[PDB]
Amino acid sequence: DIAILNDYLSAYLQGNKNSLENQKSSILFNGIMGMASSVTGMTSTAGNAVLQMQAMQAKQADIANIPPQLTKMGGNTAFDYGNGYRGVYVIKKQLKAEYRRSLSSFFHKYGYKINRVKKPNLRTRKAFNYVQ
Amino acid sequence: YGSEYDIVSVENHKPYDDMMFLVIISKSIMHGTPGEEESRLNDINASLNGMPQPLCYYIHPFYKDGKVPKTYIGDNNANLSPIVNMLTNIFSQKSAVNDIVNMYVTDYIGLKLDYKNGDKELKLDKDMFEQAGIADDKHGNVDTIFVKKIPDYEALEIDTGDKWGGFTKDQESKLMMYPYCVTEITDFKGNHMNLKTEYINNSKLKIQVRGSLGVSNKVAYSVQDYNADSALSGGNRLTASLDSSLINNNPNDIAILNDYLSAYLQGNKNSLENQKSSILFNGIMSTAGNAVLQMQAMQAKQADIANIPPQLTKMGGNTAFDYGNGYRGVYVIKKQLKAEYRRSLSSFFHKYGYKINRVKKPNLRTRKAFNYVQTKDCFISGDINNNDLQEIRTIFDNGITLWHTDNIGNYSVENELR
Amino acid sequence: DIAILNDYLSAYLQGNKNSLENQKSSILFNGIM
Amino acid sequence: MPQPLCYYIHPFYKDGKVPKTYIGDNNANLSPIVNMLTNIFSQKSAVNDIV
Amino acid sequence: NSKLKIQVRGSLGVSNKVAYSVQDYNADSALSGGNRLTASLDSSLINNNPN
């Protein structure tokens, strides 16, 4: 909305002195925001070795990727078009290089999790095939 | 890593330093200019102001003393009146009283100005601004600034220096990472953003200020290098930086009319006071390998330190309170874990290294004194009978400390690199 | 409904059109995962 | 939908400039925005029943 | 600090606003007095009540 010369408009801007209203929402629950009895007596099958690696690398939490300032973004139209915010934006995001490196090395050695009933890929790669 | 952070460093940055800007919005022209072919007084004047604007618009700089910087518009001294004198004058003038819509103060109008803070002097663009004479009560002509045309707003950068400066450095470097340390940026007016310094793609914390001259105050402080890819262009970084920047939506307006409506929401001033701010809420709160695991378990992270003040909600709203006590611009608050937990975690990291969780060949001789090494399903080859080779594999699979100095067991050393 | 009158009131809640816009719609929340 | 309100649109660039606009085969002869806004809000009778 | 010291800050705005702070709370030993008070708002008690 753009301001509109009227008898009405000064009433319109106490409508926006209702920015003191953005206080409850833009805060989120930011307050909220490996297998030790293994191993002994095998030791140790390649499978349970991987399981422990999964346990030690266990996902503690997902990356929200929801900005807590969404609440405050659209209020001022003069601000938006002034600083060149207009139309749609496509932001492609991917994990930090440290974890790419980390996860890539893991997937490379011991393949992906499958959870299907089938006959296994025994000779698909040029060098090696892991199978459990 | 504890229950609370230490506040190790505090710094404050203001876009125009000592200079602030008062802002007046009206329906019609209230002023006169040197040499104008026509009193523009009381006329409707639409203008570009971030966007096509039907409103008339007045700007006036000031310092906390109340005096105003020597201001040139083009090559002409605008002859700016002291702030309180104009305010008295603008609200005493017959016409001006009835179509002044709103008034607020801002730390950044949306332009990098030619401002020398040393000599308290400001030069303005001949084309965007104009000398504005509001003159007459019984008398007293005051000079201020009318905004002619501001088609595009721009950003102003702030260099706060070394991103890691302020933190008391411990020799285990990981204790400088999140969540052990965190750089907080806040305007102390209800807007607040935590940053993981390690993920600032720069050696320096650089802040980008963006502003507006809209109907109310709106300023945003950004850190465009935060979570930016190495190969991301500057413009693109600034654009996307809004997601993790600090947006001062707070209306820094000063009051102008009781009516019926102002009173009614002063009837409902209290309703906005029923915050629940601290009911908000929190949500409150014998191999070497397994030896370490149990050690990880006994000091297991029970809870993360939120670092969102439950009193954030109440910080803005009162402009007279904020500027009275000197709350203005953006503040960079660097926090680090309590000394007690640093000792604890540092001592642990020193003996048994960091958690790694990636597949590589192990660091066996990187430190001067010792290297701890634990593996899982490790592969060790070589010209050795497969029985013995199989045993060596299990040795590293179970964890082992490899000494490089004859003083074995002396963990008091630094054990640095090389 | 389709609009029929500005008055003072229609404008005031167009003053508060934005307030209903401060949804928190994707900070809503999930409780994700 | 069936709307009882009168309705006006005007194209613009951030510059303030206006694209050459033809309505059918006729040059609409569009005024710059800043001029119009000034003009539309200056007519007092019409102004206060702009929704 | 060995003592609980409270810092009272006020205003004469359009409504009542007083804040009680404890500037030594979570303050680094080497943090200046002004900075302690400055940052103390996060962990202060802000009487936003209009009265």
XYZ file of C-alpha atoms in Angstrom, chain A residues 2-124:
123
model
C 0.931 3.593 -0.716
C -0.306 6.430 1.496
C -3.471 8.122 0.194
C -4.253 11.815 0.728
C -7.488 11.983 2.746
C -9.499 12.963 5.801
C -8.962 9.270 6.444
C -5.225 8.810 6.196
C -4.096 10.018 9.639
C -6.366 7.241 10.947
C -4.528 4.924 8.522
C -1.128 5.418 10.203
C -2.124 4.492 13.739
C -2.984 1.330 11.905
C 0.771 1.002 11.384
C 1.737 2.175 14.915
C 0.797 -1.440 15.223
C 4.350 -2.435 14.494
C 4.742 -2.739 18.267
C 2.640 -5.793 17.415
C 5.499 -7.569 15.648
C 7.072 -8.288 19.063
C 5.332 -11.689 19.983
C 5.911 -13.643 16.659
C 9.396 -12.966 15.295
C 10.772 -14.776 18.284
C 10.485 -18.475 17.737
C 11.415 -21.464 19.849
C 15.040 -20.553 19.554
C 15.092 -21.675 23.215
C 14.902 -25.231 21.947
C 17.184 -23.881 19.230
C 27.195 -43.196 20.124
C 26.211 -46.772 20.987
C 28.522 -47.278 23.958
C 27.408 -50.844 24.848
C 29.041 -51.843 21.595
C 31.408 -53.496 21.100
C 32.789 -56.606 22.915
C 32.945 -60.238 21.752
C 33.050 -60.403 17.947
C 35.042 -58.041 16.937
C 33.748 -56.559 14.760
C 31.663 -57.308 11.679
C 31.829 -54.661 8.957
C 28.121 -54.046 9.467
C 28.167 -53.078 13.145
C 31.281 -51.025 12.461
C 29.161 -48.973 10.063
C 26.295 -48.819 12.568
C 28.554 -47.232 15.177
C 29.804 -44.784 12.549
C 26.151 -43.951 11.933
C 25.644 -43.551 15.686
C 28.703 -41.325 16.090
C 27.583 -39.256 13.105
C 23.933 -39.200 14.200
C 21.772 -36.298 13.012
C 21.140 -34.198 16.127
C 18.896 -31.639 14.408
C 17.749 -30.455 10.979
C 18.624 -27.058 9.523
C 15.452 -24.987 9.742
C 16.171 -22.469 6.981
C 13.234 -20.343 8.056
C 14.325 -16.762 8.821
C 12.907 -15.486 12.147
C 12.595 -12.002 10.618
C 9.920 -13.037 8.105
C 7.534 -11.208 10.404
C 9.338 -7.899 9.792
C 10.091 -8.065 6.052
C 7.018 -6.765 4.201
C 5.854 -3.791 6.276
C 7.436 -0.894 4.369
C 6.717 -0.652 0.643
C 8.949 2.392 0.120
C 11.749 0.391 1.724
C 11.241 -2.649 -0.510
C 11.198 -0.894 -3.875
C 13.820 1.568 -2.688
C 16.414 -1.106 -1.978
C 15.409 -3.080 -5.054
C 13.422 -5.949 -3.572
C 10.905 -7.009 -6.186
C 9.600 -10.167 -7.830
C 10.730 -13.692 -7.008
C 14.162 -14.871 -5.857
C 15.620 -18.370 -6.162
C 18.200 -19.101 -3.461
C 19.926 -22.457 -3.814
C 21.431 -23.601 -0.529
C 23.735 -26.518 0.236
C 25.596 -27.809 3.292
C 29.049 -26.629 4.382
C 32.114 -28.001 2.586
C 33.310 -29.607 5.815
C 30.239 -31.862 5.938
C 30.214 -32.500 2.196
C 33.761 -33.776 2.559
C 32.687 -35.723 5.652
C 29.560 -37.360 4.206
C 31.095 -37.912 0.755
C 33.959 -39.952 2.217
C 31.474 -42.062 4.180
C 29.105 -42.705 1.262
C 32.103 -43.488 -0.932
C 33.412 -46.278 1.270
C 30.178 -47.867 2.525
C 27.533 -46.873 -0.047
C 24.011 -45.582 0.597
C 21.293 -46.879 2.915
C 18.833 -48.908 0.841
C 16.102 -50.622 2.886
C 14.776 -52.660 -0.040
C 14.307 -56.367 -0.665
C 16.184 -57.179 -3.863
C 19.262 -58.848 -5.282
C 22.364 -56.745 -4.492
C 24.688 -54.690 -6.673
C 27.775 -56.914 -6.545
C 29.611 -55.661 -9.630
C 28.472 -52.162 -10.571
